[PDB]
Design a protein around this ligand. Structure first.
Ligand SMILES: [Cl-]
Ligand SMILES: [Cl-]
Ligand SMILES: [Cl-]
Ligand SMILES: [Cl-]
Ligand SMILES: [Cl-]
Ligand SMILES: [Cl-]
Ligand SMILES: [Cl-]
Ligand SMILES: [K+]
Ligand SMILES: [Mg+2]
Ligand SMILES: [Mg+2]
Ligand SMILES: [Mg+2]
Ligand SMILES: [Mg+2]
Ligand SMILES: [Mg+2]
Ligand SMILES: [Mg+2]
Ligand SMILES: [Mg+2]
Ligand SMILES: [Mg+2]
Ligand SMILES: [Mg+2]
Ligand SMILES: [Mg+2]
Ligand SMILES: [Mg+2]
Ligand SMILES: [Mg+2]
Ligand SMILES: [Mg+2]
Ligand SMILES: [Mg+2]
Ligand SMILES: [Mg+2]
Ligand SMILES: [Mg+2]
Ligand SMILES: [Mg+2]
Ligand SMILES: [Mg+2]
Ligand SMILES: [Mg+2]
Ligand SMILES: [Mg+2]
Ligand SMILES: [Mg+2]
Ligand code: NA
Ligand code: NA
Ligand code: NA
Ligand code: NA
Ligand code: NA
Ligand code: NA
Ligand code: NA
Ligand code: NA
Ligand code: NA
Ligand code: NA
Ligand code: NA
Ligand code: NA
Ligand code: NA
Ligand code: NA
Ligand code: NA
Ligand code: NA
Ligand SMILES: [Sr+2]
Ligand SMILES: [Sr+2]
Ligand SMILES: [Sr+2]
Ligand SMILES: [Sr+2]
Ligand SMILES: [Sr+2]
Ligand SMILES: [Sr+2]
Ligand SMILES: [Sr+2]
Ligand SMILES: [Sr+2]
Ligand SMILES: [Sr+2]
Ligand SMILES: [Sr+2]
Ligand SMILES: [Sr+2]
Ligand SMILES: [Sr+2]
Ligand SMILES: [Sr+2]
Ligand SMILES: [Sr+2]
Ligand SMILES: [Sr+2]
Ligand SMILES: [Sr+2]
Ligand SMILES: [Sr+2]
Ligand SMILES: [Sr+2]
Ligand SMILES: [Sr+2]
Ligand SMILES: [Sr+2]
Ligand SMILES: [Sr+2]
Ligand SMILES: [Sr+2]
Ligand SMILES: [Sr+2]
Ligand SMILES: [Sr+2]
Ligand SMILES: [Sr+2]
Ligand SMILES: [Sr+2]
Lengths: 142, 172, 132, 337, 160
RNA sequence: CGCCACACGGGGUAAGAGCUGAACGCAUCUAAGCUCGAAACCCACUUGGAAAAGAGACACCGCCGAGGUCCCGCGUACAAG
RNA sequence: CGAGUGGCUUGCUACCUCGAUGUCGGUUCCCUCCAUCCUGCCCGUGCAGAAGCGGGCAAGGGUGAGGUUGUUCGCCUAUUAAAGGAGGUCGUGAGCUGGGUUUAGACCGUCGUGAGACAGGUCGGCUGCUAUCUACUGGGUGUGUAGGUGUCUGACAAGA
RNA sequence: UGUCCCAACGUUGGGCCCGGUGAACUGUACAUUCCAGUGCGGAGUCUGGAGACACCCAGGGGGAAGCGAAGACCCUAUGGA
RNA sequence: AGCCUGUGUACCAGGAGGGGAACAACCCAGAGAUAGGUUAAGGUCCCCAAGUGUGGAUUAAGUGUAAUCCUCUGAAGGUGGUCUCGAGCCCUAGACAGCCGGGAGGUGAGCUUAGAAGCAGCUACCCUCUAAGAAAAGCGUAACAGCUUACCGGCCGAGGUU
């Protein structure tokens, strides 16, 4: 519901971890960031081993709880949280001025951050956040 | 490396992105040829498969892409056909085409009919104890043929004794 | 097995002593096991009308005494429910010795038998004088 | 050797706490197939009696014979589909978009809601239809309420409100089907939705039993033999192993039992009538007398007499429908005795 | 008993028979096989089995490998084939076992082993250009019964 | 101890059965691609769930009064609450 | 003959604990592992069938009742689809039991001059505590989001 | 013959709420924890993550190697009886 | 054996501070107070100060991102997964593979045998036509038949094989 982002990043065909690392860096420097097209973000490797890892995180837990996100929405945001000292004041503040979106709720297109782009013509072993979520059982709302 | 394939006069080959479409009097076939650093394109009256890489893995796919394209050429003109013979011993096997799937009844004396959906615009024509599978896309045709044979596969009993089923008789 | 045609509240367990309603020479039978049955932890295996059971001859002629035989429960004191809702119950608990083919080993049955048991074991029925 | 044994009670109905709404809330609806139609109705539990029925089952060795069947009598008077709510699809799931209300309201609907005095039904409809053109429309549901007043045995006059989905043909068709109902006054009946012989899923808040111990609440054994005389009779062996050093939420413990929502599948509707044919002599115990619209559900229904029960076309029926079973007898014998 | 117990050279050389008694006999039946009346010079081919790691090989292992090797050469060239094979190592190292906690632990004598430095020839065969592939197979079977990995090195034999 | 109710069907896989297919003119179930395939995985079904800090959505009512508390008669509820 | 994995058996060590961390077996209740006994799906056969035998994937669910013995184990019986094995302080005595082990009484055999002993047998023989914290099962009051009523959404969570 | 299958209902006294009366055990400190790891190898406090809005009522006792007793077992002492 | 018992030495004990996730004795380092500066070990995508540094190569397993270690496993054995380097031989007088055509007569060799004719066994294993074609390498047959290998020719066209 309205987010005055100083920066709108487009995660389409972009390496999730590399984008996450730059968004964390900027958020810590005071920038308000909106990551768009999360379902289209990308992660390299064997789809079978990548999914096993995310499935293990979904299965982990107990009474204390290990709530792991399944939507590309939350997967990406958690990824960013792991690069932020979210339990510290400054860290929680940065994390809270960051938001990820399915599709692009803005009229302005996002920008592609340098070094985070994956070239589909040169790569075949990678998966999409959307694909992961579907496998995890998420409701493909996007 | 680079390989050039002169497209047949009877054929027209258009292509956008990673998808290639081939059309002829016998129909059309579209395929996605996607592999790291292998560019496929239609340079006038010739289809080109090229890459700056030449390692075994790359060469493997290049040769693979070629055959796929040459097969598309062949399928849109001459077409692809597979012949099958329905053999059975004690129980009269009823093989029929219904809708977009081939149905088999009374297999080995079973009450429940066995069936499979035909792939693509593949055509299945049955004449007595003979079946012919044909179409422009060798993928859909070859599978449909195979599926029919698999459809009468038996794991439970000794095959040397129970041989009922439909088998691929001729391969294109 | 073929549906019985009535609901049964098993009135017997492993070890129960029951009447042998026939002329095989066996007077009292002890329930050892129930055909086709499998219970749960701590649960004593139960049997009722219509069940085939393995039995041991407790009282009777020397020749029959101690033999481990198969039998069919024909009567029980615990009520059963018939399709029309009525409950049916007998004066005692009884079973009939039966062979590997479910044919009665004896020649004559003693006392009434539930119609439902008769439907299941016909040869047993074609020995009954009274079917209720 | 420590024999195996399934655990005590299911882990699928927790936490075992007091229900938030005494009015049941379906968490699933039938699939769209037939013509448009409201996918549910409601009523108040009265009690039980039994009926003799002609065996309907074509695969039963008894087909065509007398069969006594237990029946729970539910008073199902007419309800009021008072509004049409539309849901729009969004990245975060379905969300209420707008509602189209009516003018005619039951005299006592104001005991629960602040009834509309000024509303624009066409503006609402407009926005909805535009949502459909846009292709952002999620299912369509009707705001529904009961008329307790029509039921003498039930003391309440305050209506019970629940939302019920409308499924059917094309959205455009059922959207119009929905608007049709609402406008009138929303008044509809059990007939309009169900036919005797069909299978329904019944939902309701079970009878409350307050706090109960592990034995009754989870079905754990009582201590046995000598173990029953030392000072422990109805307490479980232990709360868990040395490690993990904590009590897992899976061990059977004391707590609230009863007054939980339950959705019971495939309940056969034996008969939908009106009058006092099912009433019992002396009156249903702790309830009263029935003489109005009623439904006879095969078997048991969750809840105590007077509680609101909800019906929905079975979403996972096991058997095919055998419409209008033949009822040869309906016991009216006193339930005291 | 596992060879893991003795395969390493983690103890002093213990070979002095004048100070050790009760030493079990070796299980090695022969050290010279094939036609031992003929010289190794009379053959065009000489292939050796070279150990790649320094180790100790118990006599029970020498016998098993040597046996499964010569056995093959016999089955493939005959009980008198024109070939000859040699096992050049002898198990001089006496082995113990402490078989009563760690008190007075010096073990009792239980066997013998041969110390083989990495790179050494354990076995060496001499054959004709024909039976060259048969000896290479005999060694493949032999190195499967001794601790270390081995190289099947072909010395005189430029008939590739 | 009595009575009632507790799927079918989808989707993706394992082992495995295959298709097309090259590296290696052939062959090859595999290297890219694909058709199938387990009581197992996901969905389907039930239960909880605005404290989900991005702390939610809709409709109507009200801001001199909508609604609510105390009070009173009671239980479909309940150890206090 | 050679190479390993496990940490279920036993042995070894003496690192932790002697101002005490109560034993074996059983019981009750909960979670887990797979090296799979059954159930699902497969491959091979010295696979006609039926059925065996061997192998693969697979831990969702199941794996029960009884006779001797404190027994674990095991032997035995009738059932069963099968009646698998193992980890959780050899899970579980501020939960139970007290048969066994393991005080003080007594007997037998053996040993000892004797007192007395036995890694033998045998009869009898005691089980404290009002929960501070934490953990969990259920039940409330507040604050936050930020005037009220009603209806919902569904991130997550549990299920066999 | 309810020891058991397999538990149910009931009775009296407690338990729960209210008035009055009114102790003791225990307390280095901090303390909302959970999963792993590490560490004198058996951690609420160290490390990494996960979870976690405060307070209160009832409960059965998983953990605090819970509280109670300078281990009775075993060994040692140029100890005792 | 994070075992027992020696020996030399530095360390802990009795040694801070920096690094090593934590961590007596592993690395840097021996330290009065305070202040500025430059380095050490170690590190420079984010958590966290410094590179999303440069030239180049390999890896597709999330191998790996783990100096030392009770603490970080990974073995014998196997691998036309892939990369790189070398040696021998064959090839436009056409190699390697594939496909097509030919694979013939004396004679079904002699012997053995009722029979055996490439192919039960024993012995021999010769020459015609010719561009080739065994007294026959593998199936097949009661024995024949039949199906292929060798060998030759054609089509094809560039590396192939060890
Ligand atoms: Cl969790
Ligand atoms: Cl933090
Ligand atoms: Cl790739
Ligand atoms: Cl039994
Ligand atoms: Cl007990
Ligand atoms: Cl110093
Ligand atoms: Cl990873
Ligand atoms: K101690
Ligand atoms: Mg028991
Ligand atoms: Mg009554
Ligand atoms: Mg009565
Ligand atoms: Mg010590
Ligand atoms: Mg204690
Ligand atoms: Mg396995
Ligand atoms: Mg079989
Ligand atoms: Mg499980
Ligand atoms: Mg224990
Ligand atoms: Mg305890
Ligand atoms: Mg105790
Ligand atoms: Mg106590
Ligand atoms: Mg005793
Ligand atoms: Mg005395
Ligand atoms: Mg005793
Ligand atoms: Mg002391
Ligand atoms: Mg003493
Ligand atoms: Mg003294
Ligand atoms: Mg000191
Ligand atoms: Mg930084
Ligand atoms: Mg790894
Ligand atoms: Na990655
Ligand atoms: Na999780
Ligand atoms: Na007590
Ligand atoms: Na304990
Ligand atoms: Na499936
Ligand atoms: Na399983
Ligand atoms: Na026993
Ligand atoms: Na313990
Ligand atoms: Na115990
Ligand atoms: Na005790
Ligand atoms: Na115990
Ligand atoms: Na009692
Ligand atoms: Na406790
Ligand atoms: Na020093
Ligand atoms: Na540090
Ligand atoms: Na990894
Ligand atoms: Sr940066
Ligand atoms: Sr509802
Ligand atoms: Sr729900
Ligand atoms: Sr007691
Ligand atoms: Sr613990
Ligand atoms: Sr040593
Ligand atoms: Sr070896
Ligand atoms: Sr496969
Ligand atoms: Sr809120
Ligand atoms: Sr202590
Ligand atoms: Sr496994
Ligand atoms: Sr099986
Ligand atoms: Sr034990
Ligand atoms: Sr024993
Ligand atoms: Sr146990
Ligand atoms: Sr005792
Ligand atoms: Sr004794
Ligand atoms: Sr004893
Ligand atoms: Sr605050
Ligand atoms: Sr911490
Ligand atoms: Sr208490
Ligand atoms: Sr870089
Ligand atoms: Sr580089
Ligand atoms: Sr350790
Ligand atoms: Sr290492
Ligand atoms: Sr290896």
């Amino acid at each position: 519901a309205e987010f005055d982002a100083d920066v709108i990043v487009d995660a389409r065909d972009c390496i999730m971890g590399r984008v996450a690392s730059q968004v964390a860096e900027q958020a810590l420097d005071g920038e308000t960031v909106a990551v768009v097209n999360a379902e289209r973000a990308v992660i390299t490797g064997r789809e079978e081993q990548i999914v096993e890892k995310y499935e293990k995180r979904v299965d982990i837990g107990n009474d204390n709880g290990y709530f792991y996100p399944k939507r590309p929405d939350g997967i990406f945001k958690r990824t960013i949280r792991g690069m932020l000292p979210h339990k510290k004041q400054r860290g929680r503040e940065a994390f809270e001025s960051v938001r990820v979106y399915l599709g692009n709720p803005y009229d302005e297109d996002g920008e592609v951050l340098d070094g985070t782009s994956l070239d589909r013509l040169s790569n075949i072993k990678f998966v999409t956040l959307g694909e992961i979520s579907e496998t995890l059982g998420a409701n493909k709302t996007w | 490396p680079r390989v050039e394939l002169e497209i047949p006069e009877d054929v027209d080959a258009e292509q956008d992105h990673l998808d290639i479409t081939v059309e002829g009097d016998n129909g059309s076939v579209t395929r996605r040829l996607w592999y790291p650093d292998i560019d496929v394109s239609v340079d006038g009256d010739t289809v080109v498969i090229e890459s700056d890489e030449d390692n075994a893995k790359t060469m493997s796919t290049i040769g693979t892409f070629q055959s796929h394209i040459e097969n598309m050429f062949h399928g849109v003109t001459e077409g692809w056909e597979y012949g099958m013979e329905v053999f059975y011993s004690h129980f009269p096997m009823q093989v029929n085409v219904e809708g977009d799937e081939v149905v088999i009844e009374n297999f080995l004396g079973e009450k429940a009919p066995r069936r499979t959906t035909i792939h693509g615009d593949t055509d299945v024509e049955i004449d007595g104890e003979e079946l012919t599978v044909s179409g422009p896309d060798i993928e859909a045709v070859g599978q449909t043929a195979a599926d029919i044979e698999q459809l009468t596969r038996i794991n439970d009993k000794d095959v040397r004794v129970f041989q009922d089923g439909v088998y691929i008789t001729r391969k294109p | 097995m073929e549906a019985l045609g009535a609901d049964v509240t098993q009135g017997l367990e492993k070890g129960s002593l029951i009447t042998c309603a026939d002329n095989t020479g066996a007077r009292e039978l002890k329930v050892i096991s129930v055909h086709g049955y499998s219970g749960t932890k701590n649960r004593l295996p139960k049997a009722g009308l219509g069940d085939k059971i393995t039995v041991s001859v407790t009282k009777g002629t020397p020749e029959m005494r101690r033999q481990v035989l198969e039998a069919v429960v024909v009567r029980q004191r615990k009520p059963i429910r018939r399709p029309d809702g009525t409950r049916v119950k007998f004066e005692d608990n009884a079973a009939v010795i039966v062979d590997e083919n479910e044919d009665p080993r004896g020649t004559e049955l003693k006392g009434p038998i539930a119609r439902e048991v008769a439907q299941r074991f016909g040869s047993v029925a074609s020995a009954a004088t009274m079917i209720v | 050797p420590q024999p195996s044994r399934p655990r005590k009670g299911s882990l699928g109905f927790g936490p075992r706490k007091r229900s938030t709404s005494e009015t049941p809330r379906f968490n699933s609806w039938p699939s769209d197939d037939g013509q448009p139609g409201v996918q549910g109705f409601a009523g108040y539990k009265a009690g039980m009696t039994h009926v003799v029925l002609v065996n309907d089952e074509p695969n039963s060795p008894r087909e065509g014979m007398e069969e006594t069947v237990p029946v729970t009598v539910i008073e199902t008077p007419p309800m009021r589909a008072v509004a049409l709510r539309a849901y729009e699809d969004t990245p975060y799931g379905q969300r209420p978009l707008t509602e189209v209300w009516t003018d005619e309201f039951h005299s006592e609907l104001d005991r629960t809601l602040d009834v509309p005095e000024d509303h624009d039904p066409d503006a609402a409809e407009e926005q909805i239809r535009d949502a459909h053109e846009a292709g952002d429309l999620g299912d369509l549901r009707l705001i529904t309420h009961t008329v307790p007043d029509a039921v003498p045995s039930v003391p309440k006059k305050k209506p019970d409100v629940m939302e019920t989905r409308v499924g059917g043909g094309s959205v455009s068709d059922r959207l119009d089907h929905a608007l049709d109902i609402v406008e009138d006054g929303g008044e509809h009946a059990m007939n309009d939705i169900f036919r005797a012989g069909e299978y329904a899923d019944v939902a309701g808040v079970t009878k409350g039993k307050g706090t109960q111990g592990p034995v009754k609440r989870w079905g754990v054994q009582k201590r046995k033999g000598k173990h029953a005389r030392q000072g422990w009779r109805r307490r479980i062996g232990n709360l868990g192993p040395w490690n993990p050093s904590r009590v897992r939420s899976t061990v059977p413990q004391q707590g609230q039992t009863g007054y939980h929502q339950r959705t019971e599948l495939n309940k056969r509707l034996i008969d939908i009538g009106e009058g006092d044919e099912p009433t019992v002599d002396g009156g249903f115990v702790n309830y009263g007398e029935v003489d109005g619209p009623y439904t006879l559900v095969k078997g048991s229904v969750p809840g105590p007499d007077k509680r609101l029960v909800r019906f929905r076309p079975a979403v996972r029926p096991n058997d095919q429908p055998r419409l209008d079973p033949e009822v040869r007898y309906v016991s009216n014998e006193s339930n005291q005795g | 008993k596992p060879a893991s117990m003795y395969r390493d050279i983690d103890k002093p050389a213990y070979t002095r028979r004048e100070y050790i008694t009760g030493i079990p006999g070796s299980k090695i039946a022969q050290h010279k096989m094939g036609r031992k009346q003929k010289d190794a010079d009379d053959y065009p081919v000489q292939i050796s089995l070279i150990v790649e790691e320094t180790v100790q090989l118990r006599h029970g292992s020498l016998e098993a490998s040597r046996l499964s090797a010569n056995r093959h050469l016999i089955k493939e060239l005959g009980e008198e084939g024109d070939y000859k094979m040699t096992l050049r190592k002898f198990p001089h190292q006496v082995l113990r076992e402490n078989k009563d906690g760690m008190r007075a632990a010096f073990g009792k004598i239980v066997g013998t082993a041969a110390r083989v430095q990495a790179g050494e020839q354990l076995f060496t065969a001499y054959c004709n250009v024909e039976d060259a592939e048969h000896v290479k197979e005999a060694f493949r079977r032999a190195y499967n019964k001794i601790t270390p990995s081995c190289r099947i090195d072909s010395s005189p034999a430029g008939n590739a």
